[PDB]
Amino acid sequence: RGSFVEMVDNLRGKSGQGYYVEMTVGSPPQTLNILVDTGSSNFAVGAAPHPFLHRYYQRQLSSTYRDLRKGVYVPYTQGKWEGELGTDLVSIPHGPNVTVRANIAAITESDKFFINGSNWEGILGLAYAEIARPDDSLEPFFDSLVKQTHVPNLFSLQLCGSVGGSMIIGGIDHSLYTGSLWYTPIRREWYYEVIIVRVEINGQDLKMDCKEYNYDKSIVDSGTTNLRLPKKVFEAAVASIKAASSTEFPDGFWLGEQLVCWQAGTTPWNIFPVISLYLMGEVTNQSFRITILPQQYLRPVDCYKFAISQSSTGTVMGAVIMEGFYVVFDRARKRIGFAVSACHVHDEFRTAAVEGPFVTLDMEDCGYNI
Numbered sequence: 195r196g197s198f199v200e201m202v203d204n205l206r207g208k209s210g211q212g213y214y215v216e217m218t219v220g221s222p223p224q225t226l227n228i229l230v231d232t233g234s235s236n237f238a239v240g241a242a243p244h245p246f247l248h249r250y251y252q253r254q255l256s257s258t259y260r261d262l263r264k265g266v267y268v269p270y271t272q273g274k275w276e277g278e279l280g281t282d283l284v285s286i287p288h289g290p291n292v293t294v295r296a297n298i299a300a301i302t303e304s305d306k307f308f309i310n311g312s313n314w315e316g317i318l319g320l321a322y323a324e325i326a327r328p329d330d331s332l333e334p335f336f337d338s339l340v341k342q343t344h345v346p347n348l349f350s351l352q353l354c355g356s357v358g359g360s361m362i363i364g365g366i367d368h369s370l371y372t373g374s375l376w377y378t379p380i381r382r383e384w385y386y387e388v389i390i391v392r393v394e395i396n397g398q399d400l401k402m403d404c405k406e407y408n409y410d411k412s413i414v415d416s417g418t419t420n421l422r423l424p425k426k427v428f429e430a431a432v433a434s435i436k437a438a439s440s441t442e443f444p445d446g447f448w449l450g451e452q453l454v455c456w457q458a459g460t461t462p463w464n465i466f467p468v469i470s471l472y473l474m475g476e477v478t479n480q481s482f483r484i485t486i487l488p489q490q491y492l493r494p495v496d497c498y499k500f501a502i503s504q505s506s507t508g509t510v511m512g513a514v515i516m517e518g519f520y521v522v523f524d525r526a527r528k529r530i531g532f533a534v535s536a537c538h539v540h541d542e543f544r545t546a547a548v549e550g551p552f553v554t555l556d557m558e559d560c561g562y563n564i
């Protein structure tokens with residue numbers, strides 16, 4: 195219940211190319227590296243010899259494959275993926291010792307989806323049925339896992355910023371964090387939706403109507419690299435970080451339109467402010483705060499990209515946030531826990547922090563309604 199040595203260090207990746215876990219599909223087992231994505235709900239894998247792919251799901255080789263005789267099409271702003279639905283037997287070698295029948299989308303056509311040079315071949319959507327494609331009747335993987343086994347209804351993620359981490363399926367590993375876990379309610383079970391109630395740059399409040407911090411929504415998404423902020427909030431946030439770091443920068447850098455370079459080992463972390471998000475707590479009028487460093491929001495590509503950007507889909511707490519913390523997706527109790535990660539990158543002056551309780555009024559007003 196508190197120690198899962200089998201699952202520690204079961205994630206791999208490359209900077210900016212997401213985190214992946216090893217999975218097997220079909221009988222006999224076909225090994226595939228699968229992107230871990232808490233911002234989507236489909237289990238989808240390359241099923242055809244796309245040139246970018248190390249390997250792909252070969253349905254003809256599996257005796258346990260069952261065709262659902264149904265297509266699925268997933269567009270993105272950029273490109274897309276398209277495939278054929280089926281079910282097959284699925285395991286996670288460095289996960290719980292179980293095998294489940296899950297829906298799988300065999301990807302037959304895609305655009306700007308697979309990354310040239312990456313080491314993953316599919317995507318594991320860990321969010322809820324509501325945002326599954328083509329509709330909410332297509333049971334997501336984790337739902338299937340919980341339904342078919344005795345694996346507890348929760349998972350946790352330690353993303354360490356090439357890169358590595360841990361996905362603990364069915365529990366929490368206490369060696370992966372220090373201090374205490376603090377929980378924020380899952381507002382609605384579709385994305386992992388939460389509510390930000392206050393934002394501070396270097397301890398200084400933005401003083402914005404908190405409703406705007408969640409304009410549209412705020413989600414925890416392991417499939418996104420950046421901390422993404424709603425347009426208006428991003429404007430204020432950049433304006434504050436820009437002013438907090440007026441010690442040394444082009445206009446395009448803040449918009450993610452170009453990179454900025456320093457000499458090796460001369461990176462001025464200290465000119466940059468810490469960023470705190472206060473999240474709604476479990477108790478009426480109670481919140482807690484998570485604090486990240488420039489180590490998190492300045493992502494190396496010594497050339498770094500500013501890893502905070504604007505959004506029209508709301509706040510996205512991507513890898514920038516998540517790499518500072520151990521994150522518990524406590525589905526059984528409709529909450530997400532945050533604790534200081536035992537593996538986060540820091541200096542001798544400042545570290546990532548999770549602190550509470552704080553008194554925050556009108557936290558319900560911060561939620562944006564349709």
Ligand SMILES: NCCc1ccc(O)c(C2CCCCC2)c1
Nearest residue numbers: 210211212231233234307417419
């Ligand atoms: N919900 C979609 C998740 C997703 C799909 C295809 C991708 O190529 C990516 C990459 C974008 C850059 C960051 C790493 C992962 C993410």
